[PDB]
Write an enzyme that holds these catalytic residues in place. Structure first.
Site, mmCIF file in Angstrom:
data_model
loop_
_atom_site.group_PDB
_atom_site.id
_atom_site.type_symbol
_atom_site.label_atom_id
_atom_site.label_comp_id
_atom_site.label_asym_id
_atom_site.label_seq_id
_atom_site.Cartn_x
_atom_site.Cartn_y
_atom_site.Cartn_z
ATOM 1 N N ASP A 292 0.868 -1.207 -0.044
ATOM 2 C CA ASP A 292 -0.001 -0.146 0.152
ATOM 3 C C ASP A 292 0.953 1.298 0.037
ATOM 4 O OD1 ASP A 292 1.015 -0.321 2.516
ATOM 5 O OD2 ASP A 292 -0.758 0.119 3.541
ATOM 6 N N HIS B 170 1.609 -8.977 -3.168
ATOM 7 C CA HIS B 170 0.459 -8.279 -2.834
ATOM 8 C C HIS B 170 1.071 -6.923 -2.873
ATOM 9 C CE1 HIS B 170 -3.738 -7.669 -1.577
ATOM 10 N NE2 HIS B 170 -3.295 -6.874 -0.646
ATOM 11 N N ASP C 6 1.353 -19.120 -5.399
ATOM 12 C CA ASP C 6 1.678 -17.637 -5.456
ATOM 13 C C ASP C 6 0.319 -17.019 -6.067
ATOM 14 O OD1 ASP C 6 3.118 -15.467 -6.404
ATOM 15 O OD2 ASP C 6 3.854 -16.297 -8.392
ATOM 16 N N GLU D 197 1.935 -11.470 0.942
ATOM 17 C CA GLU D 197 2.087 -9.957 1.677
ATOM 18 C C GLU D 197 3.612 -9.832 1.616
ATOM 19 O OE1 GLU D 197 1.151 -6.397 3.984
ATOM 20 O OE2 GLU D 197 0.638 -7.315 2.119
#
Length: 433
Positions: free
Chosen positions: A57, A359, A403, A412
């Protein structure tokens, strides 16, 4: 086998370059990343640009960011030779400074500190390149009315550790770092409280546990950076008052009792601290749950991060003269599992069949002007950019793994995931492994 630890260390540094927020330097190596979050600012418009994006993020979460900085600096101090042997000393210092330059900006007043830029929901609702963000990015702070001993304490520790790193190469910066470190510790100690009770947005992302260990951690680092006995006395007094010897062992962004213990053992040479460290390490080696293939399985969240953090504690313990050979060997098995001994690499851009769909927003995006949005997240294809050096969450308790970009548990990646890992790599290089 036969892993190039020097190159994995360099790769980890590339991961941190990929996490940089703000205006990127001309010598940036991860060039697919661009200038972003250039409007990050405090409540009075103070410049808050820079620092590291937390994970996949674009929120700048101060608690794990400070923890990351402290651990990276810690490894740079104790295993500087590892960085030098890898020709990564300058970059290692830069990785620490990228964080501390930001902490200095966030320290807007002696007893005021910004602990977050970006709101969890507004930030996470967006999937794309950071330079394409258009949503408001609120800045949250702790102060005398809304304290945060853990956040201020970890930041003080990071600054103090960094002051040691730059003691000779940049004395002026070192002095500046120390000034801020002393003030933040006073703030943390004089105004007690959990930072997530103040910066409430953080309560559901990086919630405060028990801030008390942070006060001891910060005091210990300040003693190491100043040789001022007052800090040592405070560290040991609080250690006893809070009864840290009875706390659950470990090294993590929210609880670092083992870090405090191995640090104090080195600073005081007292046997009591060494006993607690040996007990914890022996427990991990002999009894902690492990996957069939040998990976320490401490928790489902950031599984590899926990194993690598434990490995670093073991490497630090070995330096104390505690079962050096066995501790170093065991630490190596954990790092080696992450590198591929379990069947595949769990470090992006490295080794055999590594994760290709972390991610992670910025690496998933194609270059502009092509659109990057949730359809990109939804793509079956591997992330457009290889996120070299990133340690993923990892496999489950039975070494199983797929994956998948939507699988945040296993795919993550985060700044705090690579900290212990990177410092452990520096140690392995320093040891000639």
């Amino acid at each position: 086998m036969a892993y190039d630890y020097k190159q994995v260390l360099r790769d980890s540094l590339l991961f941190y370059e990929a996490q940089r927020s703000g205006r990127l330097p001309a010598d940036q190596k991860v060039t697919w990343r661009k200038d972003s979050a250039l409007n990050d600012q405090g409540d009075q418009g103070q410049d808050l640009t820079g620092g590291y994006f937390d994970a996949g993020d674009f929120v700048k979460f101060g608690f794990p960011m400070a923890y990351t900085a402290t651990v990276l600096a810690w490894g740079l101090i104790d295993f500087e030779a590892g960085y030098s042997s890898a020709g990564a000393l300058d970059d290692g210092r830069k990785a620490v400074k990228w964080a501390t330059d930001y902490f200095i900006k966030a320290h807007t007043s002696q007893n005021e500190f910004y602990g977050q830029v970006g709101q969890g929901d507004a930030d996470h609702a967006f999937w794309g390149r950071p330079e394409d963000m258009t949503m408001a990015r609120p800045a949250y702070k702790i102060d005398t009315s809304r304290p945060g001993s853990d956040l201020a304490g970890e930041t003080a520790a990071a600054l103090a550790a960094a002051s040691i790193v730059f003691r000779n190469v940049d004395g002026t910066y070192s002095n500046n770092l120390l000034t801020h470190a002393r003030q933040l510790f006073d703030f943390a100690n004089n105004y007690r409280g959990k930072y997530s009770d103040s910066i409430t947005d953080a309560r559901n992302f990086y919630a405060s546990a028990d801030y008390r260990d942070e006060l001891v951690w910060a005091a210990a680092w300040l003693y190491r950076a100043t040789n001022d006995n007052t800090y040592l006395n405070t560290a040991e007094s609080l250690y006893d008052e809070f009864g840290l010897q009875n706390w659950g062992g470990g090294l993590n962004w929210d609880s670092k009792v083992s870090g405090v213990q191995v640090l104090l053992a080195k600073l005081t040479n007292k046997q009591a601290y060494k006993d607690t460290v040996q007990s914890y390490v022996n427990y991990l080696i002999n009894n902690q749950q492990k996957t069939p293939k040998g990976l320490l399985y401490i928790d489902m969240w950031g599984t590899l991060r926990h194993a690598a953090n434990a490995a670093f504690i073991m490497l630090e313990a070995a330096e104390l003269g505690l079962s050096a050979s066995s501790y170093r060997q065991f630490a190596q098995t954990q790092i080696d599992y992450a590198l591929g001994d379990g069947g595949r690499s769990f470090v992006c851009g490295f080794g055999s069949n590594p994760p290709t769909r972390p991610h992670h927003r910025s690496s998933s995006c194609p270059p502009a002007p092509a659109t990057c949005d949730w359809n990109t997240f939804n793509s079956p294809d591997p992330n457009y950019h290889v996120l070299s050096g990133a340690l993923v969450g990892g496999p489950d308790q039975n070494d199983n793994y797929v994956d998948d970009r939507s699988d945040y548990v296993h795919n993550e990646v985060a700044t705090d995931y690579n900290a212990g890992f990177q410092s452990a790599l520096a140690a392995l290089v320093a040891l000639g492994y």
